[PDB]
Amino acid sequence: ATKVAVAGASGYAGGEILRLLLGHPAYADGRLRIGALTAATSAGSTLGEHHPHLTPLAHRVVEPTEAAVLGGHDAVFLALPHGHSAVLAQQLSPETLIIDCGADFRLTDAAVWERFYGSSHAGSWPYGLPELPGARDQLRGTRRIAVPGCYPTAALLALFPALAADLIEPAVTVVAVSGTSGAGRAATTDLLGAEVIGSARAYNIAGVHRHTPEIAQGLRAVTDRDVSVSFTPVLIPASRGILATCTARTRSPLSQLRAAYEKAYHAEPFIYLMPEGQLPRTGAVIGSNAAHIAVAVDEDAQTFVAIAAIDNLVKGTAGAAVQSMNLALGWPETDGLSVVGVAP
Amino acid sequence: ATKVAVAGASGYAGGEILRLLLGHPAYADGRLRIGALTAATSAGSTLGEHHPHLTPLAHRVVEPTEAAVLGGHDAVFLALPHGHSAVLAQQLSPETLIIDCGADFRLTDAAVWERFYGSSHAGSWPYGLPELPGARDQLRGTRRIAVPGCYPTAALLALFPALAADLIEPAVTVVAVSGTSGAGRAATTDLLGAEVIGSARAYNIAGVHRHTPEIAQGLRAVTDRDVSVSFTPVLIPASRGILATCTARTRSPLSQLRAAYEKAYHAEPFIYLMPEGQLPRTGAVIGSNAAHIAVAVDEDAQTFVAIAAIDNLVKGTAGAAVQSMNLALGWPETDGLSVVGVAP
Amino acid sequence: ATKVAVAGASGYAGGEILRLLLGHPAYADGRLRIGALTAATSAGSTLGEHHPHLTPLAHRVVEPTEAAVLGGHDAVFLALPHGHSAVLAQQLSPETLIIDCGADFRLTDAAVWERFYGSSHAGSWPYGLPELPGARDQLRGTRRIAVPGCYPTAALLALFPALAADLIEPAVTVVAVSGTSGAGRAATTDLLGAEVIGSARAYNIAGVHRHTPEIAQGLRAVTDRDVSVSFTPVLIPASRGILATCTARTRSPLSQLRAAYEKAYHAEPFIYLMPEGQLPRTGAVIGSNAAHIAVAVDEDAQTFVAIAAIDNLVKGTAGAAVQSMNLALGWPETDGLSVVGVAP
Amino acid sequence: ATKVAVAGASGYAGGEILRLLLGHPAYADGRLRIGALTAATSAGSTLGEHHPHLTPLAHRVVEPTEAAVLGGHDAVFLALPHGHSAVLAQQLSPETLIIDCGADFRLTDAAVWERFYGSSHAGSWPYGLPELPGARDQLRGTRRIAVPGCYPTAALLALFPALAADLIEPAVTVVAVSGTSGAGRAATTDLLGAEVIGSARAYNIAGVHRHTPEIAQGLRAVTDRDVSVSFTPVLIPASRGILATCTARTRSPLSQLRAAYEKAYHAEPFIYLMPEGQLPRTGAVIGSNAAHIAVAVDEDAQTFVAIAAIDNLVKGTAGAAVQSMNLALGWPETDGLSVVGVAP
Ligand SMILES: COc1ccc2oc(C(=O)O)nc2c1
């Protein structure tokens, strides 16, 4: 009865929305209808030209991207770059579920948006990260979703408990490796297979990366102290995956950092704490909506280290969208989002 | 009802079988229960120490592979080296469904089997290739199953429908590239990551790879003529996937061959014919039970060319295992096996 | 005192030429200066913005590709392995040593050329593959070089000693895996890292690959029969590397065939026969101008199998180019060319 | 004429010394000669069996690792599987140049050594990082040399100059990604291509890594305050390369920090300072002995960021090893070591 359209369907995100939408129970029983699949430039093509893993929808024809095609859908995924979701949302009937993978609606501070993105703040919508305290309540039956960035999802999951229990200091370093699908499907020379194979490199360093404020915005959402974030992302030879290594100055004990995480997550179905003597690997969460997380303390340096492993495309993008979609239409949150990753 | 056991749950196959069983719809509604996860290798530990993606079963403990342990199971998965499924099939009730991922019960010729293994021939169970014509009816209600080798699964899918209608000569050549995951978890020096990264090498050439006669066996089943197969495997920097390039001297028009395949596979839900001038790619099938297949004709060389992409671990082993038992138990055969790959 | 210019310096073939020139003995003593570096687009930027691995040259500003800029150089390299260089070559003084990496001057049949390239045939220079019979002689002193394609160099190297001795039939099959760098540096979607990592796809199949007639061409110079080439190329997750699997039916015994290959190759310094029971791998030759070669007989298939492994940018391109530059300036053939690869 | 021996030649470390030795200019003129090749578990096999990339020495036989096999050599490179070569070192003539790629003779603090390794402190020989203040002198004419770890080489090359001019706090964080050739050649189930490919994982975190102290020790040698090291190593899908992300609270403008680096390094030919707007990548330095460094300041977070790239098997092992052995014998430091990488 609920028909959904996808803007950006030819992208990596839109291909991952459509993969999950195809595995959904409400798509098996026909509750959910895959409607119009639109793209910016390849309007006229079949889906199987872009996404040959989506063979069920291979025949589909990709449509232009305007409200003339997105009307009369109940949900609408925008897997768009920024600046487009803002104008496009305003064009759709305010009763339709807009779920935005773009950044346009993530930020609460307008002057912060302006410094990192260079367009005008559209405004804030419910953040698509159910585990974040106070977010699940906000998304229940909501008709707007701003899905998080991939890196902030890894960083908040790794760091927020220990800072929410005031067991670490509100200055955190984050260094996260990520696979090449976070860069997008836009072809450049830095994303050529020959350039990324057999090479790592960090980029947009020393605070300029746009996720930096997102990490701090979500860290400020469980603390009263000023929050400082040094963010460094590294590109590695992998197609999916994000290993976030999170550090902060601490003084509290391990048994208290530990016990605070399993209280935060012992009921969270998608967040998994590694058994003692295990560390997360991106490999283990790939294709799933899970996050493998380990905590430890560096004593000779008085530092808390949290490590976190998500899939940039699932829990960092599309999974988060469908998860928070489920809460938006009252369906079971884990409707269609497995915790078993495809390995090796 | 229907209790399930897995012998050799330590290795790549066991985990993959467990991964499928966890998504099987009979596991949701209870008609299937995951029981003894047995293993000679490291009996005593938790699964998670070996399969950190199967976290619903990370707590389970690896009992050793014993007749006593598999006893009292309505179904026993056997993903171990050759020779031990001959031993253990003899130690279990002839009514228990035995699905063997090993080699023992595949070759219905006896001098051939001793020829390339040095064993002595255990016997012959129905070939778990529900798309080999006739094989579907020999598994509808069976209790003994031998699932195929990964490369044969791909060659015979690429080659049979054209040899079946004798549009090709029975002298076939097949060079197939595969990931490191079909070589097993037995840590050897040449399977190391540093060596297999950035490297492709041929191995077990000049028809001495024990998948050579298994391709033969499948192929005589569709020709009265004299088959001779030149098989070369090549290993490439990937973990899952098989791309099989299969060519043969031909003289029939492309149209005659094209339509033969559309006939053999139009109502095959797992076998997908690439649209005209599209080509299989392993990344599109990985994590899926799909075979992606394309054919053309080399006129100047008067060769038929067939390309077949399977996920080596799903459709080439575990997914076929699961597929056969679906037919064994009179459950729909598409249950718990998807055609949507995980890509990129 | 030889001045050298490279047209196409911002790409892979050009960059690898420069890399071999910087470690050349003639460059170390002033006998070879590195003149102009040109490319179509991106003039005025620095070479380090394209090849940060070539830090000795990183300061060099890239100039426009005109026959002017290229003038006043004793040797000019045309780094266009996928481009068309015939125009320029006939606008430069004919006293210049011209090394064309592209295909324009490879083929000695205008008809074959128009069919596979859709353009007017521009002629036929000495094939820069010194190892093939009577190839090294036409090169000694030559001021015009046609550099062979990566795939062609491999297949030819593994099959010709045996066609030449009439110890195999002239109907050869060649299936070659290659890293993504042979696809050049043009930013196309299907060459992004996300796409090529974890996948393998055959491309341009059924003899529609412009390298098919080149292998036929080079093979025909060693026999009298026509030669029928079934050539299949596959892309694998690697940046460099070519491992060609070459089959052909025979009734020769192996010891005769190995005899052929030792005779063809005992005094060839860039060509290494694998000891009995060893097979080449691509990682073993990356960086080196070497080729690694094995040969076997599938007897139950009456087939002869050869494996060749070379680097697609060294022996398949810049190494051959430089190896034929040494023969063209009367310098030692191995000057600048290592036989030791950079593994792992 | 210096006869050189290599203990543990069949490992990644050893293979990389012999490769560098073959390109050394004193191995062409004959002042250097490759003597014994000791191999613990494979005496009696052919080196080619272990290092198919080293074909000039494929024929050599691997001998048992014994002091008589080595004696009678002017130089002995020690590269044991887990170092711990103090025992064997003691069995050698004091006349001999001993270059230890292990850890036993690295650390100058015997209690530190005991705590991290759990063993006798055997002492400390000159550290093979000629670029460190006052270390190059300790190296001219030495006959003992302790090769530094791959990780400390990069962390100390990214951090020493800031600390040396007192421009950062002495509390430093290091997150370093690395290829699997830094973890040795010992066949283990988590070092398999199927496990590494597709995955990143941090290991031995939060002070547990035996290179945390090494980084701490080299940093102390340049400032008068005391230093803490948060060190986190991350394994990524690559055979070679380390990308070190280094941070510390900042005391200064960036102009002060860049000056500190251009002064410290401008006369170091293996250290390359990235230009305006560029950042280092591991793929630029592969197989060269260069390190590429860039530095920046994150003003919002009051954090300095250094990024360093080196080939772990070259500048973190065999290159430092041969670069030291050049100074041990008064040869030019740069002999046999290029600053040009094998990209892509
Ligand atoms: C992570 O959030 C996004 C948002 C837009 C995107 O677009 C693409 C693309 O590949 O075209 N990937 C995307 C990811």
Side-chain angles (χ1 to χ4, degrees), chain A residues 1-2 4-30 32 34-65 67-83 85-86 88-89 92-94 96-139 141-142 144-168 170-224 226-248 250 252-344, chain B residues 1-2 4-32 34-94 96-114 116-135 137-139 141-174 176-224 226-248 250-344, chain C residues 1-2 4-30 34-81 83-89 91-106 108-131 133-138 140-144 146-165 169-173 175-204 206-218 220-224 226-234 236-242 244-248 252-253 255-257 259-261 263-275 277-344, chain D residues 1-2 4-30 32 34-40 42-61 63-65 67-79 81 83-87 89 91 93-94 96-119 121-123 125-139 141-142 144 146 148-213 215-219 221-223 225-238 240-261 264-275 277-296 298 300-344:
Chain A
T2 39
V4 65
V6 183
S10 55
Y12 278 139
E16 199 59 11
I17 301 168
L18 291 162
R19 189 182 68 90
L20 300 170
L21 279 184
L22 281 175
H24 205 281
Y27 168 85
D29 79 355
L32 182 43
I34 279 165
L37 297 204
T38 75
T41 279
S42 40
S45 36
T46 71
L47 201 61
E49 288 183 272
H50 316 269
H51 298 317
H53 63 305
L54 312 189
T55 63
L57 302 132
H59 52 283
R60 304 286 292 257
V61 279
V62 196
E63 289 172 86
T65 313
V69 167
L70 310 196
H73 297 78
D74 304 303
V76 46
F77 289 109
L78 311 162
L80 294 211
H82 85 276
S85 77
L88 203 40
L92 307 149
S93 283
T96 46
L97 188 59
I98 307 163
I99 301 174
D100 190 25
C101 285
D104 297 73
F105 289 96
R106 301 183 185 168
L107 297 193
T108 62
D109 204 321
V112 163
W113 175 272
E114 200 100 61
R115 238 157 180 168
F116 279 94
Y117 280 93
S119 54
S120 194
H121 198 208
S124 307
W125 289 348
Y127 202 51
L129 177 63
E131 300 70 357
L132 188 147
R136 200 173 277 97
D137 302 338
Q138 257 190 118
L139 293 151
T142 184
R144 299 296 186 268
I145 295 167
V147 198
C150 38
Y151 290 123
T153 296
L156 295 156
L157 289 182
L159 279 179
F160 82 78
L163 182 61
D166 223 327
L167 294 140
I168 60 108
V172 305
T173 316
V174 178
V175 179
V177 300
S178 169
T180 47
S181 53
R185 260 253 240 226
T188 83
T189 302
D190 303 288
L191 316 161
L192 283 202
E195 295 302 320
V196 320
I197 281 167
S199 165
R201 70 192 159 88
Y203 66 95
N204 298 326
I205 73 196
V208 304
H209 200 280
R210 282 157 179 175
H211 277 159
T212 321
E214 213 165 327
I215 289 177
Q217 176 171 294
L219 285 166
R220 299 204 175 102
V222 286
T223 184
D224 56 280
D226 315 352
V227 175
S228 325
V229 185
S230 179
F231 182 58
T232 299
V234 184
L235 227 63
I236 75 148
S239 64
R240 301 167 155 253
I242 278 170
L243 193 279
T245 293
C246 304
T247 61
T250 198
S252 35
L254 175 53
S255 57
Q256 203 174 350
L257 298 159
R258 183 65 65 185
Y261 272 74
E262 79 196 3
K263 185 89 206 222
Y265 299 146
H266 79 101
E268 276 294 355
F270 298 127
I271 327 295
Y272 175 88
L273 269 90
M274 300 296 292
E276 307 311 288
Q278 282 168 14
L279 294 178
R281 48 189 75 158
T282 48
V285 303
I286 276 166
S288 79
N289 208 47
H292 291 11
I293 289 170
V295 288
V297 188
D298 199 326
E299 290 199 21
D300 292 28
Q302 291 181 0
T303 298
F304 176 66
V305 316
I307 308 174
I310 70 157
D311 191 320
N312 64 298
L313 286 191
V314 192
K315 176 66 185 184
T317 317
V322 155
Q323 186 182 345
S324 35
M325 170 197 80
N326 290 335
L327 307 186
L329 309 177
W331 302 356
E333 180 153 339
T334 57
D335 256 25
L337 308 155
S338 158
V339 298
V340 209
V342 193
Chain B
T2 344
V4 133
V6 170
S10 36
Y12 287 137
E16 211 34 19
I17 299 146
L18 291 171
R19 177 181 90 81
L20 296 174
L21 294 164
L22 276 184
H24 203 315
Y27 183 91
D29 80 335
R31 307 192 170 271
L32 186 147
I34 305 194
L37 305 191
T38 80
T41 48
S42 205
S45 52
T46 36
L47 205 67
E49 304 171 57
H50 312 260
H51 293 339
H53 52 288
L54 311 174
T55 51
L57 329 168
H59 55 70
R60 305 275 203 100
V61 195
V62 168
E63 336 177 5
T65 56
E66 290 156 346
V69 178
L70 306 140
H73 280 117
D74 292 336
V76 181
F77 275 104
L78 297 199
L80 291 129
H82 80 311
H84 320 123
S85 47
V87 174
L88 271 66
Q90 300 180 30
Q91 304 177 17
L92 283 137
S93 163
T96 175
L97 177 63
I98 290 208
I99 308 203
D100 183 29
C101 291
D104 289 345
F105 292 101
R106 316 197 274 210
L107 299 165
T108 82
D109 187 298
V112 168
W113 158 276
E114 196 220 10
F116 270 156
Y117 294 108
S119 301
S120 281
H121 173 220
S124 147
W125 292 356
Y127 204 69
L129 214 169
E131 294 90 355
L132 248 202
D137 289 345
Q138 305 210 344
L139 298 157
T142 173
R143 297 294 181 192
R144 300 288 182 268
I145 302 189
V147 312
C150 44
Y151 294 121
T153 300
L156 311 173
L157 275 172
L159 281 196
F160 95 83
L163 188 49
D166 193 76
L167 320 177
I168 81 166
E169 291 331 314
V172 296
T173 38
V174 164
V177 294
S178 178
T180 59
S181 178
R185 266 176 117 156
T188 87
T189 307
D190 275 271
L191 295 172
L192 275 198
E195 291 282 79
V196 317
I197 277 168
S199 210
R201 60 185 183 68
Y203 69 99
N204 287 347
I205 70 186
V208 303
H209 189 279
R210 301 138 296 290
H211 281 180
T212 314
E214 189 183 341
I215 298 190
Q217 152 149 1
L219 278 181
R220 312 195 190 105
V222 309
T223 206
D224 36 10
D226 198 273
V227 70
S228 74
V229 51
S230 168
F231 178 67
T232 307
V234 165
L235 290 151
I236 60 139
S239 68
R240 279 166 190 256
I242 278 154
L243 196 279
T245 282
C246 317
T247 62
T250 188
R251 253 158 153 277
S252 325
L254 179 63
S255 325
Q256 201 158 112
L257 285 121
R258 179 60 178 163
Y261 280 74
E262 273 92 77
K263 186 199 47 48
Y265 299 146
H266 60 306
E268 282 306 322
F270 290 141
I271 313 312
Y272 182 79
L273 292 213
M274 298 300 311
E276 184 70 281
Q278 268 181 59
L279 277 152
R281 79 180 62 166
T282 60
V285 301
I286 275 161
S288 147
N289 200 41
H292 282 204
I293 296 199
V295 300
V297 188
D298 196 329
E299 315 200 59
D300 298 356
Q302 285 171 26
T303 295
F304 159 77
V305 183
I307 315 297
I310 56 190
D311 193 334
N312 68 330
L313 288 190
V314 188
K315 180 61 180 170
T317 297
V322 174
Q323 202 188 348
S324 295
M325 63 151 258
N326 265 14
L327 292 154
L329 309 178
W331 292 338
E333 184 199 0
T334 55
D335 286 350
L337 321 164
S338 196
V339 308
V340 198
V342 188
Chain C
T2 320
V4 178
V6 183
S10 61
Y12 291 150
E16 190 73 330
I17 286 167
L18 287 178
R19 172 174 104 54
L20 287 172
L21 283 197
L22 286 189
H24 198 268
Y27 177 74
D29 63 29
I34 277 167
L37 303 181
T38 84
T41 190
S42 78
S45 55
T46 79
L47 188 90
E49 302 178 65
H50 311 294
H51 305 296
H53 68 126
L54 297 170
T55 57
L57 292 183
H59 59 283
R60 302 277 202 102
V61 159
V62 198
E63 298 156 77
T65 314
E66 320 180 7
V69 186
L70 272 53
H73 289 69
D74 301 273
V76 157
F77 273 96
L78 291 170
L80 275 66
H84 310 303
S85 40
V87 163
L88 285 299
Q91 310 190 207
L92 303 178
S93 64
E95 301 295 308
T96 315
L97 174 45
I98 297 181
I99 325 291
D100 198 16
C101 292
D104 300 86
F105 305 88
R106 276 181 224 170
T108 79
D109 198 308
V112 193
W113 168 278
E114 293 150 59
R115 178 191 171 190
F116 288 99
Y117 284 87
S119 75
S120 325
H121 195 213
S124 153
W125 295 357
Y127 212 48
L129 214 176
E131 277 84 24
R136 173 172 284 122
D137 282 346
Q138 312 172 312
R140 306 202 144 97
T142 202
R143 312 283 304 187
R144 269 325 180 254
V147 175
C150 55
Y151 292 119
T153 296
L156 275 180
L157 268 175
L159 281 161
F160 95 88
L163 197 73
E169 293 177 350
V172 299
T173 325
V175 182
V177 296
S178 196
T180 74
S181 78
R185 213 169 157 171
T188 80
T189 287
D190 264 310
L191 282 179
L192 290 134
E195 298 301 310
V196 313
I197 287 192
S199 197
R201 56 185 178 82
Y203 63 89
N204 299 142
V208 314
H209 198 271
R210 311 176 157 157
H211 286 198
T212 325
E214 185 170 336
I215 307 179
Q217 174 182 319
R220 280 191 285 246
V222 315
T223 194
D224 306 313
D226 314 293
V227 181
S228 175
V229 173
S230 182
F231 166 67
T232 307
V234 188
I236 55 154
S239 35
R240 282 179 195 232
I242 294 169
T245 297
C246 311
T247 77
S252 320
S255 59
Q256 190 191 8
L257 271 152
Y261 276 84
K263 197 267 151 293
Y265 283 150
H266 67 278
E268 291 285 349
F270 292 133
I271 309 297
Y272 179 89
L273 277 143
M274 313 291 305
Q278 291 180 19
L279 304 179
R281 59 196 54 195
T282 57
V285 306
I286 310 298
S288 66
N289 202 44
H292 288 10
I293 308 265
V295 281
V297 173
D298 199 348
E299 287 147 65
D300 289 345
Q302 282 294 36
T303 313
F304 155 80
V305 197
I307 321 296
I310 55 154
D311 182 329
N312 67 281
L313 283 198
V314 192
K315 192 18 161 155
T317 312
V322 156
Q323 179 184 351
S324 301
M325 187 208 61
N326 292 344
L327 280 166
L329 303 173
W331 297 352
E333 217 181 328
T334 71
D335 271 17
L337 319 172
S338 165
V339 175
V340 175
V342 167
Chain D
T2 302
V4 191
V6 156
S10 79
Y12 292 148
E16 195 60 7
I17 314 144
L18 299 155
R19 173 182 98 70
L20 270 198
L21 281 190
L22 296 167
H24 201 305
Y27 170 85
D29 70 2
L32 180 275
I34 289 103
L37 311 186
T38 59
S42 203
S45 36
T46 68
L47 183 61
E49 289 170 73
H50 309 287
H51 297 331
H53 61 293
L54 298 169
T55 49
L57 326 166
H59 56 268
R60 304 277 206 117
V61 51
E63 297 156 79
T65 321
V69 185
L70 274 60
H73 285 99
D74 312 296
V76 162
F77 286 86
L78 280 179
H84 305 347
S85 37
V87 169
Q91 316 191 3
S93 150
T96 74
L97 180 37
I98 298 209
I99 321 195
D100 187 23
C101 298
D104 298 343
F105 304 101
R106 264 171 208 165
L107 304 173
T108 61
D109 198 304
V112 153
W113 169 269
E114 290 193 332
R115 171 192 193 188
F116 275 102
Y117 290 88
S119 267
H121 192 230
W125 313 344
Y127 207 46
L129 177 63
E131 275 92 349
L132 275 192
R136 163 157 300 103
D137 306 6
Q138 303 200 45
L139 286 167
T142 198
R144 301 313 187 266
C150 34
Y151 284 125
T153 316
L156 291 159
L157 278 162
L159 286 169
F160 100 68
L163 208 41
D166 196 33
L167 294 183
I168 51 162
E169 290 311 321
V172 305
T173 295
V174 167
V175 179
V177 305
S178 154
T180 56
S181 94
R185 198 150 191 210
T188 324
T189 48
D190 53 3
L191 277 204
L192 292 193
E195 300 299 335
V196 183
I197 296 186
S199 210
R201 57 191 181 72
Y203 66 113
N204 292 344
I205 50 145
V208 180
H209 199 272
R210 291 169 176 180
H211 290 189
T212 318
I215 288 169
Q217 165 174 301
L219 280 179
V222 285
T223 206
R225 327 197 200 284
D226 219 320
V227 317
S228 36
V229 180
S230 195
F231 175 56
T232 320
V234 182
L235 268 211
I236 46 88
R240 303 175 174 231
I242 286 166
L243 195 273
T245 297
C246 303
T247 84
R249 256 223 57 215
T250 196
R251 301 175 171 209
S252 270
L254 166 71
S255 53
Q256 269 213 313
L257 281 146
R258 264 214 101 179
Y261 276 80
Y265 282 140
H266 91 102
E268 297 288 356
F270 287 95
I271 317 303
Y272 183 81
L273 295 174
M274 308 305 301
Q278 304 199 15
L279 289 175
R281 68 191 55 184
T282 57
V285 294
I286 290 323
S288 77
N289 203 48
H292 292 9
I293 315 300
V295 292
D298 194 342
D300 275 318
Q302 302 182 106
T303 307
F304 172 74
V305 295
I307 301 291
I310 48 152
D311 186 335
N312 63 283
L313 281 183
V314 179
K315 190 41 174 170
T317 305
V322 160
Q323 178 184 18
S324 290
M325 172 220 96
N326 279 349
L327 293 156
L329 311 144
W331 302 348
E333 218 178 329
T334 71
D335 262 23
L337 309 158
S338 162
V339 297
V340 178
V342 181

